[PDB]
């Protein structure tokens, strides 16, 4: 942060945040290019993967700067442009989570993206590490949340409708819809399972249907389904909570 002895001081902690903002803007533009398109091509999938790796490494460096609470570094990030980058990442996460889930060919991209989100939340938690009541960092994070309210609402609904999926699949009504314990259920039986559960509305039921991949046999592997859409939900949602 500050080279005390040296005649001239350079703020590496701020330069890192600056690069983070630049890469976030690049990723946001490269997503806005693909928002209209139905399917992301292989080249696009590779480019997202490389950009997500770079952003993940930058987030890890930023959280290494501040863990083991470094008050100076925490204040520098608080007064830097970190909030602007986090706002853009929140929008990208809120929309790409709803987009990539429907397509069954972007499982790896979704997994990389939902690990980038976990690293971002870990960095945010490290920012609040060693907080005081009515702190400036708390005020700025509340401001950033208020600015990105809608994106967080969409993320939280995405997490909730998948955290309820474990209860649905562990319910006994599911067991009497699928008497065998093999773990393979038909799409119609899964639909009537959601309908009998009644904690899912029509929109959530149809979205779960769209995000569920079924073969020509009109059946799917709901254990694999609930896994892919539950453990990332379970850990990211815990960090957010």
């Amino acid at each position: 942060r500050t080279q005390t002895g040296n005649n001239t001081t350079v703020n590496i902690i701020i330069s890192t945040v600056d690069y983070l903002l630049r890469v976030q803007e690049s990723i946001s533009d490269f997503y806005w290019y693909y928002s209209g398109k139905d399917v992301i091509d292989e080249q696009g999938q590779r480019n997202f993967s490389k950009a997500i790796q770079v952003a993940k490494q930058v987030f890890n460096t930023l959280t290494e700067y501040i863990q083991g609470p470094c008050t100076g570094n925490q204040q520098s990030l608080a007064h830097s442009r970190l909030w602007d980058a986090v706002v853009g990442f929140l929008h990208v996460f809120a929309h790409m989570q709803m987009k990539l889930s429907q397509d069954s060919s972007q499982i790896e991209l979704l997994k990389e993206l939902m690990d980038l989100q976990k690293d971002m939340v870990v960095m945010l938690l490290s920012m609040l590490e060693g907080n005081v009541v009515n702190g400036t960092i708390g005020k700025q994070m509340v401001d950033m949340l208020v600015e990105s309210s809608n994106n967080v609402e969409m993320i939280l609904k995405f997490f909730d409708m998948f955290l309820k999926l474990k209860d649905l699949t562990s319910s006994d009504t599911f067991k009497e819809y699928d008497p065998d314990g093999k773990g393979v259920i038909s799409k119609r039986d899964f639909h009537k399972a959601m309908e009998s559960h009644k904690h899912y509305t029509q929109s959530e039921t149809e979205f779960l249907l769209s995000c569920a991949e079924t073969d020509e046999n009109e059946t799917l592997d709901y254990e694999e389904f609930v896994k892919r859409f539950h453990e990332p939900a379970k850990d990211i949602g815990f960090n957010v909570a």
């Binding site: 533009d29 806005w32 290019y33 928002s35 209209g36």
Partner: protein
């Protein structure tokens, strides 16, 4: 409308005021225009 000579000639800001409705990105605006 001249506002430098406010002491001698009153300015008519009523027809100079504008309001900012929307601030969209270039990509979003192009997509909307395409739609």
């Amino acid at each position: 409308e001249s506002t430098s000579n406010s002491k001698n000639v009153p300015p008519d800001l009523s027809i100079c005021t504008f309001v900012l409705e929307q601030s969209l990105s270039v990509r979003a605006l192009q997509e909307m225009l395409a739609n």
